[PDB]
Symmetry: C3
Subunit: 300 residues, 3 copies
């Protein structure tokens, strides 16, 4: 049983709700006891001490806390713990599915993410009018999950449009997310990958696999092995092992009947996790087909 801990800079709403927490240096620890406590003065790091304060226009406060998770298998029991979990994944300290990422939607506050920092939904229109005295008020989004890069930039990674990567995404070194790529929380790449399509929550893509432009990986839990290629505008509703290809523009769902080299057919889920597969739609017959790659024959 592994725990985790982190000193964080939390922003709270006027009613005390946790809007976010930024943890500069999260870490894994021995299993222990779940709790968030307000840091005493002498325990606030100097770089965070200058950041603590109250924003009278937003009606928020920023405070320095320490959050401990006694066990990463427990569900998050509050926003601080949820944020810590998401930082652990994004710092690559834990791989997707290495901690319990359940219930986070239920636990996290819906936030107005602005060029002035996090704001509550409550009284936002009045807050917008106050903040406008400072200059333009830009809302980047309204949601429970903020932009990963606004908490951590992981190394060895490119992200062409960082609006498309949620905090809690795990991007292994050599990974590039292009504009059309999207990576959800508790999801991402284990190695080097070109990501130009959508990686759903819980989806993991193995080393050297690429997701083509506008490809869709369904939540379902689905994963892709190593060296797979999803063609642009393709779709995947089953897991793939290694060395699989889904053709450009083909949506393969779990219930899609696929014809095999022996002319027999099976639902695609019967092939889930298999290697060396190439999925295509025949351009003469319209039929979804599966071919064996590299003289490897097909395993159900």
């Amino acid at each position: 049983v592994t725990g985790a801990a982190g000193i964080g800079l939390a922003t709270l709403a006027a009613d005390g709700s946790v809007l976010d927490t930024w943890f500069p240096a999260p870490e894994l620890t021995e299993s222990g006891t779940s709790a968030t406590s307000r840091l005493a003065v002498s325990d606030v790091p100097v770089e965070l001490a200058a950041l603590i304060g109250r924003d009278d226009d937003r009606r928020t406060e920023t405070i320095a806390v320490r959050t401990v998770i006694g066990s990463l298998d427990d569900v998050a029991a509050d926003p601080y713990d949820a944020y810590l979990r998401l930082h652990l994944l994004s710092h690559r300290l834990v791989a997707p599915h290495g901690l319990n990422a359940g219930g986070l939607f239920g636990v996290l506050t819906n936030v107005v993410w602005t060029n002035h920092g996090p704001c509550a939904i409550d009284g936002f229109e009045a807050v917008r009018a106050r903040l406008r005295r400072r200059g333009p008020v830009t809302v980047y989004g309204v949601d429970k999950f903020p932009r990963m890069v606004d908490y951590v930039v992981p190394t060895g990674v490119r992200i062409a449009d960082a609006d498309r990567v949620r905090l809690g995404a795990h991007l292994a070194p050599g990974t590039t997310v292009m504009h059309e790529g999207f990576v959800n929380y508790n999801a991402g790449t284990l190695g080097a990958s070109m990501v130009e399509g959508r990686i759903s929550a819980g989806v993991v893509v193995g080393d050297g696999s690429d997701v083509g432009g506008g490809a869709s990986i369904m939540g379902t839990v689905i994963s892709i092995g190593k060296r797979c290629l999803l063609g642009a505008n393709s779709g995947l509703g089953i897991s793939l092992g290694d060395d699989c290809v889904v053709e450009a523009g083909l949506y393969v769902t779990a219930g899609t009947r696929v014809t095999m080299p022996d002319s027999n057919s099976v639902k695609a889920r019967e092939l889930s996790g298999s290697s060396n597969l190439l999925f295509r739609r025949n351009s003469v017959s319209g039929a979804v087909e599966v071919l064996a790659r590299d003289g490897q024959g097909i395993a159900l």
Copy 2:
């Protein structure tokens, strides 16, 4: 016989062109006489008084006005009128097609939307170099329509990436627009919907209907153009699917399938018909036979 009115904060370009207008509290009124006037000092609300001024770098001014629309049936006469219209839609005071939204392209100014506020295209490169003395100059878009959330955040809504929702989008409570979702002006949801695909101008989606990742509603080459389409209640569009006809309630389009008005679909009886002949019907499942390649429709 329904009009509208609003006190707004307008930004004018160096030549007088209306770049935008922010109306904190638009309202429906009895039918009246269309006009925009400058507020006298004593009529500018207090929260707005502090936001009036002139920006010498941008060569703009910000002014307090009152815009009255005599009849929501009339076409927008000027950009203030047009802005007031789009705010009514996004405030949900009016539903899509609840007011005349024609002709906005011709009325609206093309604007450079920046982290320093709206700017004219004319002389923009000189303006950029002046603003750079304040800090980085970031252009969010160049277009006639700005980002909804920069005017109003409607309640009961999530928007993962607020670049994707034009001012004028109507998003009923319970609606979530995900990253791949997009909602144009005079379009949106009437109830609780998960939007992860594209809602074109004029398109309305009924309560309970979900739009899968990357779905296209009424996109290019979906059909002969004339009438806008709409989705009813409890519909489901699969990821990367497409729709060029109206659906009633309880319809499904399978993932990956584009049903255009001119797509020939085969019915349970073996008889085929063009999809437009089914436009607006309920309880329909559209799918592509993974075996014969044919587009079929089934009852659900």
Copy 3:
């Protein structure tokens, strides 16, 4: 035998590496000798003189340079040369392929683009904490290519979501990029186009051609990927379609259809050919028969194919 030159405002990282360079007024010149120099005080334009400095929080410096390319056929020599090239394209002084755009990835620095300006990856987490004393730190992206519009807004153009157009995109007058549109460097439009899908590096779209929402031009598995494709004039790609061969003029690809170079297509004579064999032809309509599921190509003008 054409060169180019420009006065630029360059931002350097703490270790001296070039993060970016903004050239307000690039220009084409006779062929010459490539070099970037630091401008002398008297040669700094008044507008840029105000913008030179050192940021202690980011540990960067902004300096005024002059960059010259001796020949546009030469590969970029360094990042200043690289940014000059991308400016010439986005200023429409050079159309795509009008200059050597090879090798940029290798020459360009990977940059954290923030609401406080370009930053190095190195020491970024300490930079963030420092910058947060000024207010929120927003990272727009971590990439070797920044956003076009943050260098030049070309006239006659609309761009609904400017995160989706890389510096180096060429967008001719009358072009609109919608939210789902995307334009890469050394790529874009030659005339008036509605762009609601994705234009890859090196892809050129002819006057009056429209790219439907979600359309994929030259995307992953669209073709053996050795040569770039282009679209001629008055072509139309349906929403959610894909294209992996070049089209001539007056071609249409139906909504939702992916035409790859290796797709077999049935012609009107009932013969069939790989789509690559039609590459560059005019007056074609590609569709998948909704009854038979076969990919088919028709002539669009009453006048055949073969």
